[PDB]
Design a protein around this nucleic acid. Structure first.
Ligand SMILES: [Mg+2]
Ligand SMILES: [Mg+2]
Ligand SMILES: [Mg+2]
Ligand SMILES: [Mg+2]
Ligand SMILES: [Mg+2]
Ligand SMILES: [Mg+2]
Ligand SMILES: [Mg+2]
Ligand SMILES: [Mg+2]
Ligand SMILES: [Mg+2]
Ligand SMILES: [Mg+2]
Ligand SMILES: [Mg+2]
Ligand SMILES: [Mg+2]
Ligand SMILES: [Mg+2]
Ligand SMILES: [Mg+2]
Ligand SMILES: [Mg+2]
Ligand SMILES: [Mg+2]
Lengths: 129, 6, 88
RNA sequence: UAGCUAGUAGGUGGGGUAACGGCUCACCUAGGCGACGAUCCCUAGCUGGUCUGAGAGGAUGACCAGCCACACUGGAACUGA
RNA sequence: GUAAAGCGCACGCAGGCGGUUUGUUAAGUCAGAUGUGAAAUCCCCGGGCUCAACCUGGGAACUGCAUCUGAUACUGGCAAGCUUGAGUCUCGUAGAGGGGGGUAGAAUUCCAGGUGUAGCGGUGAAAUGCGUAGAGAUCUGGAGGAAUACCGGUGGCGAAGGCGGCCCCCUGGACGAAGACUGACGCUCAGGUGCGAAAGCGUGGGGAGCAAACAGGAUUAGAUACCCUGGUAGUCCACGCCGUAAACGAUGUCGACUUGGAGGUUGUGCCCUUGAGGCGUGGCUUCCGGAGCUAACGCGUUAAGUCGACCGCCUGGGGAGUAC
RNA sequence: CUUACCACUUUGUGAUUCAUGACUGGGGUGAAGUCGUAACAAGGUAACCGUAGGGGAACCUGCGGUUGGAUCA
């Protein structure tokens, strides 16, 4: 049955982007948003939107460019089957830098750049480039 | 397998 | 499978009201009744393996509910098993 | 190799050691271990390091240095810090 | 999927994994600090032997461990929730789904009798075989077992294996429609248990047709076969057993996301139901094809596409799925 | 002197493991051997799978299953 919403979110993006979908919706969550936040804040999506009362509904509007989408690739790193945490020195660098790695820290869900600067690390959620 | 010998 | 009135009784015996048809205790009894009833069907017949499958599903199901409830309200658990005369 | 365990697991009190302790002994409890692999088989000194490998790994424990064990084979104590 | 590789099919304890909100905890996780991580070695920069090997000062390194102090996103523990996963209820639909008991009509075979007269049967052609002791054909009657033509479908139901005349009894699941109720009760599953074609095995029945074995006639160089005439176990029933199949989609289960077209079947909503009908909304099931995937063939919303959770399995051909 | 502990050793019976053994089972490897020609084409009886029976040998035959069968059947 369904055992990882974060992973699904990422693939939902990945299939949406592929399908030239203008936007993508899904059941929302606290953590699901924090990711949208980093995604918008770092410019991979136009913006988030949470239209819900009892059943939150996270909507994402995709970005495109030349003739191709913006999110080149996005893959779940840490998993429910295999948790991945890294320290400050050890935080990853997707695409030699020109790409991000979403990490959860005791001061919140930030860029790898961000956590690095903030001198801390934590569960690394996913790569996006 | 196996004529003149062999 | 089970008589409309008969089910209806069991609803208003283990539920907080009739219409409380989905209560954990209720669900257990409806099975238990049916289980106990099919007991005689498989008293003769025996070779009816396809039907017996349904029976086991009912026992399995019943087992996953009771364990759920032991885990929530033991008091309700301890009572429900004495109240249906089972579990040992 | 799926069971293993009588000083066995704990306790109490005596004894005992440089010292804590079933270390030992008497009694009372009936415990203790194991699928996170006990038990029983096979093989083996451990480490710093060595060799290889981009790395993770794989292989290895001569020579140097640390630790352990042994001294013809089995066993025992005496002397003594 | 076809190269080695998805257990024949499920149920399910342990394990792994786990929707959504808040509080709380601070185990995981992250931060800092302080201890320690022998020297040698590797590395860096120097110095000394004529150089080098070698020797050597200092440093870096020892990516580890422990402790103390903080952090609280995520994970876990605990509290209390929530309704979208899951399940219960009501009413209906289709169906060779299962178990048990009846019963019917075609046909084969045999038994008895009538008519009848020289052939029948069989093959490529023949013969064995059956017929003048009357066969074959034909009519009447009777006994008996097995299977269910047409319907029939590119069909339906079942976890799989599988289930086709008709009727009743007992009984399992599925789907739809509205809601109401329960409030994460879930997914996967080593081990375990259960089901499991056909053949086969045990006991007792039954035995028409069919037919391993076997016999006879043919064929052939031979013919331990193919073919012909015969024909027993078996095929049938009960009860127990076996546990394997190219048990195949050679494709594990569950969930999510991702252009289209044409069928089948079973529901259900709406249009003066106007009458062939029309547009919607489910379930199951086929054909074709885009991206994408693929070594290719091909798969393609019933993926072999894009992802996650758990399981089973593969590691050159053979030896061998054999031996112990 | 005597008691406890205890080494050698002794007795019975098992377990395992190594070596070996008349004879025996298949397996592997060795240019042209003998017998047939089973498979590959519709391989001249489509092939193959499980099972059963039979036969110098491949194999044959029965029951069900598969397409990984060629053909205007
Ligand atoms: Mg004492
Ligand atoms: Mg004392
Ligand atoms: Mg040794
Ligand atoms: Mg490697
Ligand atoms: Mg000695
Ligand atoms: Mg002394
Ligand atoms: Mg294969
Ligand atoms: Mg299968
Ligand atoms: Mg050092
Ligand atoms: Mg928490
Ligand atoms: Mg029999
Ligand atoms: Mg098999
Ligand atoms: Mg196609
Ligand atoms: Mg074997
Ligand atoms: Mg041939
Ligand atoms: Mg042939």
């Amino acid at each position: 049955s369904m055992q990882d919403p974060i992973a699904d979110m990422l693939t939902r993006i990945r299939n949406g982007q592929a399908a030239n979908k203008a936007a993508v919706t899904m059941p929302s969550s606290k953590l699901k948003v924090a990711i949208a936040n980093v995604l918008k804040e770092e410019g991979f999506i136009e913006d988030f939107k949470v239209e819900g009362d009892t059943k939150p509904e996270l909507e994402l509007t995709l970005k495109y460019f030349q003739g191709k989408a913006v999110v080149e690739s996005i893959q779940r790193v840490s998993r429910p089957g295999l948790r991945i945490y890294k320290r400050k020195d050890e935080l990853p660098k997707v695409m030699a830098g020109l790409g991000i790695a979403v990490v959860s820290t005791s001061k919140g869900v930030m860029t790898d750049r961000a956590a690095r600067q903030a001198g801390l690390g934590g569960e690394i959620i996913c790569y996006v480039a | 397998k196996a004529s003149s010998x062999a | 499978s089970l008589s409309t009135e008969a089910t209806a009784k069991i609803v208003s015996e283990f539920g907080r009201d009739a219409n409380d048809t989905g209560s954990t205790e209720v669900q257990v009894a409806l099975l238990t009744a049916q289980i106990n009833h099919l007991q005689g069907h498989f008293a003769e017949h025996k070779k009816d393996h396809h039907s017996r499958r349904g029976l086991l599903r009912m026992v399995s199901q019943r087992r996953k509910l009771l364990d759920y409830l032991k885990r929530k309200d033991v008091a309700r658990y301890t009572q429900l098993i004495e109240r249906l005369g089972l579990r040992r």
